[PDB]
Amino acid sequence: GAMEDPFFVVKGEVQKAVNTAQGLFQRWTELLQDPSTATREEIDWTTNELRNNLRSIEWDLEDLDETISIVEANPRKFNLDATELSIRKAFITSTRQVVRDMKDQMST
């Protein structure tokens, strides 16, 4: 009953969420910089959907980070390539900051 490792599946979804968020953030910036086009409703909607993504991404990263601890506590069971694992770790860490950097330029 061997199972397929879904880590890389969720990883791709997080990246996809990070890409959408980035597009939303650049939009937010362009709105908040020029209140010529920047109507309140559109600003509210953009800030809201940017949060909708930052939300999914943070839960996602929590879970992903935990699976790392699970593999490290039970390595024999999972049989993961060590370079691959280090990449998993670097993905979690770098995505954390990428998102963190968006949140900083927002909440201030």
């Binding site: 199972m3 397929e4 490792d5 879904p6 880590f7 599946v9 969720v10 979804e13 997080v14 839960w59 996602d60 879970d63 992903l64 935990e66 699976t67 699970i70 593999v71």
Partner: peptide
């Protein structure tokens, strides 16, 4: 995502 990870990793 949670359910996929839970199924394979046994999230607590």
């Amino acid at each position: 995502a949670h359910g996929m990870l839970k199924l394979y990793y046994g999230l607590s």
